[PDB]
Amino acid sequence: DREPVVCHPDLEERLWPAELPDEFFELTVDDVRRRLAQLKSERKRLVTKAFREAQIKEKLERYPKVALRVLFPDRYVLQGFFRPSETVGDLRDFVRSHLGNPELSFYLFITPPKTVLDDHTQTLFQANLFPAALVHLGAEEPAGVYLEPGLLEHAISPSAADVLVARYMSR
Amino acid sequence: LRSFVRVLEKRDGTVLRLQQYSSGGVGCVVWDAAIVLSKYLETPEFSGDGAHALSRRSVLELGSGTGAVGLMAATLGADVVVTDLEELQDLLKMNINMNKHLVTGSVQAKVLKWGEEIEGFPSPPDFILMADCIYYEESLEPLLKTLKDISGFETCIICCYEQRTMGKNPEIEKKYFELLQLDFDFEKIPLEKHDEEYRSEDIHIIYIRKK
Amino acid sequence: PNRLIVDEAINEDNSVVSLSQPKMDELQLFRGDTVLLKGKKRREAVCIVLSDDTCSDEKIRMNRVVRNNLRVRLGDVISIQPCPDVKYGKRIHVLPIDDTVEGITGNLFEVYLKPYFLEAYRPIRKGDIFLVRGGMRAVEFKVVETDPSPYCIVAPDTVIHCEGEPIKREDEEESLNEVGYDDIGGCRKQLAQIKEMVELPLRHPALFKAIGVKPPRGILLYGPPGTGKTLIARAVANETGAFFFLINGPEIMSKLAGESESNLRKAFEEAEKNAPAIIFIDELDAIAPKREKTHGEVERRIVSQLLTLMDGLKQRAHVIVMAATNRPNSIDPALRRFGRFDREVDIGIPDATGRLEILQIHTKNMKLADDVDLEQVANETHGHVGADLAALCSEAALQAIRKKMDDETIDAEVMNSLAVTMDDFRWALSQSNP
Ligand SMILES: Nc1ncnc2c1ncn2[C@@H]1O[C@H](COP(=O)(O)OP(=O)(O)OP(=O)(O)O)[C@@H](O)[C@H]1O
Ligand SMILES: Nc1ncnc2c1ncn2[C@@H]1O[C@H](CSCC[C@H](N)C(=O)O)[C@@H](O)[C@H]1O
Ligand SMILES: [Mg+2]
């Protein structure tokens, strides 16, 4: 199941981050120690298909669940839950399901910069659309309708959408 | 006409300000062998137990140049007599003046050309220090005859030098130890016994004794 | 309120910052979400966060553009947090820097701004310096006015305006064209060796002393001329904020005795006064060559002055001396003694992969045609060092500029419509003689 939800920033309910003291940015001896480990580990970086296959399989086992967000041009967000083995074509079908015009010529892309997802047969794991990705939506002939009016009535706040993904990834 | 000074820091914190001349003989600048030998006298192995080994003991530095080794020993309680050519006496007198406040023993600048007859040294000293003295004709025979006439059987000679691999330098080093073996018994001090920071794989400290 | 350590970016995009996957789960961030970065002195910037396997949990990767806006260097501590919420911009105002547009006139929007922001939804905050490549050059722009303020997203409905005269850059605003690690290729292993030695002792000598590692006083760089020894020293001096002082070997030795000694004293006086500092002795074999020592009155003992000045360098001086020579065996042994020139790094002739990195660096601003095969140029450039490959790219680009038209101010849309072809690189190779 996808568990579809729609959110918009003009629904956040309640309200400027606090300034940090200059002591927060003052490096400690352990901060300098951690920087030395980064420099030594970068120098350390100086493998066949079988190792990359295991590296990919072990990475797919870590995150068996995916949360995707389609950012419409009118600032609306269509949120759905997928699996890494599913393709970009399955994400297109999910978007078409909740479209006001289910025959609109649209395209999905990741920024910055504009990187269109042309390969519909490409899985979400290969397209780096995991575990949580924000994908933009474009249209050949832009119309204000976009999402179906029925879904916009049950639209939740963006903060509530963050609760839905954290709960889904925990269980 | 200008000059530059080398600051030789001791283990206790006090520093020896040594004046050097940019134009002139080889003795006008502080050599790396003098730095190795000066810092070797401060080692706890050399200092030993109780009062320092040099404290209240006579010591004669051959080929002092600036006088880095002789001045270091003078600050450790020793009774030093820094020697060199007649042209290096104004530099020896100047460096004694610049560091006489740190001297706990005594230090005098005398003239001593290697090979000549000894005039003002009737008693053999307890120590004979040498910093980078092996490099040419005078290091071969005249220097050895000075060592033989001056040193006694209980006189400890400490020869520190840098191994040079260009021109006449490697030949003179080989001939020095070939002739040194005829009257003296030399023994190389392991690099591990030298100062932890101011030591070198190509700078040797050797203990030479008479007979 | 999570502290992260600044490191070089893998993603070359200006608006992109990289973070480790477990840290993105810890911060509940989406891949492509907007983050708010802040550092010392109230400096702020909004970016797009992406996951990275190379990235460690406590580190963040940002490119020179973000680092110059945040006024941070590599190894600095920054604060990251999701910014709720950035609104799509109604209208923005952008103006280029005076030195960055010298010799270029015309529609800077069609050439630079239009493609840069085109459907990218880039988050820009007022007072931001950003870099746009094109027209055979890299142009820096500063967002003078934004609406809404201070943060806004450059959406497709945002009006981008570039009217006005180029602006003057402030002293605090350092150049993005300045030498950095992103400008060096072919010796990434040697750069990692050097960064481990000097980055921390220069920036934090008191905190590095507590670690226990003994900091280096001098570093020996050897290799043939034009291999990038000077380039590496300038880049490290800029990336750590160290004052750079260049000393030429035969240049100092050519000066009469007395003046050459006093010039060495002044070189070390400037470094000590402007701490931290990197003294670069190019062509060290001229100053300190190994020769036989004999009993003779020499007119100048320049090597003794060098060692006296190096030994007098304390931990409160924060000065690291890097020297360059083609023949390392002709260097006086006293230079590698008493921890003076302790480390040795070999910047040698680059191989096929290393040459491709240099070609990619020296063609990042120029527009290349489809037939251009940089991999082929790298394959057939044996014996070429970084200086030869940079001049090859300059002569190949100049060839394309000569074929069109027939220096003075050229149109922006004319230079952007120009593309260097493989026949220009083949002509440059036929004339290039290392
Ligand atoms: N590794 C490199 N990556 C990119 N450019 C390089 C590299 N090495 C050299 N260059 C280019 O070479 C030119 C300057 O060379 P550089 O001065 O650094 O070499 P060098 O080894 O110090 O020799 P020298 O100072 O005797 O000419 C610049 O155009 C620079 O971009
Ligand atoms: N025949 C000779 N008689 C006396 N001193 C001599 C000599 N030949 C050379 N010397 C001196 O021996 C020294 C060699 S250089 C050693 C300098 C000093 N020990 C230092 O290392 O700091 C010079 O001072 C030189 O003047
Ligand atoms: Mg050069």
Which chains does A contact via 3+ CB–CB distances below 8 A?
A: C
Two tokens, residue C136: 């055979």
Is residue A56 situated within a structural domain? no
Nearest to C185 by CA among C375, C386, C50, C329: C386
Query: Structural domains in chain C?
Result: 2-82 (2.40.40.20), 91-161 (3.10.330.10), 191-291+298-346 (3.40.50.300), 352-431 (1.10.8.60)
Ligand 1 centroid to residue C109 C-alpha, Å: 34
Determine, for residues A35 and C200 on separate chains, whether the beta-carbon distance falls below 8 Å. Answer: yes
Is residue A167 situated within a structural domain? yes
Per-residue burial over C334-348, b = 16 or more CB atoms within 10 Å of its CB, e = otherwise? bbbbbbbbbbebebe
What is the residue range of B162's domain?
Answer: 1-211
- β-partners of residue C134 are C137
C312 Cβ under 8 Å from any chain B Cβ: yes
- β-partners of residue B8 are B16
Residue located nearest, by CA, to atom 28 of ligand 1 = C387
Supply the DSSP string of B50-93, one letter for each residue. SS-SSTT-EEEEES-TTTHHHHHHHHTT-EEEEEE-GGGHHHHH
Is residue A163 situated within a structural domain? yes
What is the distance in angstroms between the CA of the first residue and the CA of the last residue of chain C?
54
With DSSP H G I counted as helix, E B as strand and the rest as coil, what are the percentages for chain C, rounded to 5? Answer: 35, 25, 40
Give the residue on B whose Cα is nearest the Cα of C305: B4
What distance in Å separates the CA atoms of residue A71 and residue A135, rounded to the nearest whole number?
6
Is C225 annotated as belonging to a binding site?
A: yes
What distance in Å separates the CA atoms of residue C428 and residue C420, rounded to the nearest whole number?
11
Is C82 annotated as belonging to a binding site?
A: no
Total domain count, chain A = 1
Ligand number nearest to the C-alpha of B139 = 2
Determine, for residues C79 and A135 on separate chains, whether the beta-carbon distance falls below 8 Å. Answer: no
Q: By what technique were these coordinates determined?
A: X-ray
Determine, for residues C120 and A75 on separate chains, whether the beta-carbon distance falls below 8 Å. Answer: no
Total domain count, chain B = 1
* Long-range own/partner contacts, residues C247-256 (CB < 8 A, 24 or more apart): C247/C279, C247/C280, C247/C281, C247/C282, C248/C282, C248/C283, C249/C281, C249/C282, C249/C283, C249/C284, C249/C285, C249/C286, C249/C287, C250/C283, C250/C286, C252/C286, C252/C287, C252/C302, C253/C286, C253/C287, C253/C302
Sort A133 into a burial class: Cβ within 10 Å, 0-12 / 13-18 / 19+: buried
Nearest to C17 by CA among C56, C53, C47, C55: C47
What distance in Å separates the CA atoms of residue C257 and residue C262, rounded to the nearest whole number?
9
What distance in Å separates the CA atoms of residue B147 and residue B183, rounded to the nearest whole number?
10
What distance in Å separates the CA atoms of residue A140 and residue C121, rounded to the nearest whole number?
17
Determine, for residues B138 and C300 on separate chains, whether the beta-carbon distance falls below 8 Å. Answer: no
Resolution attained, angstroms: 3.0
Nearest to B160 by CA among B43, B42, B39: B39
Ligand number nearest to the C-alpha of C226 = 1
CB atoms within 10 A of CB A34: 16
Ligand 3 centroid to residue C308 C-alpha, Å: 28
What distance in Å separates the CA atoms of residue C16 and residue C47, rounded to the nearest whole number?
6
Q: For residue B192, give the CATH number of its domain.
A: 3.40.50.150
CB atoms within 10 A of CB B165: 11
What is the residue range of A142's domain?
Answer: 1-13+63-171
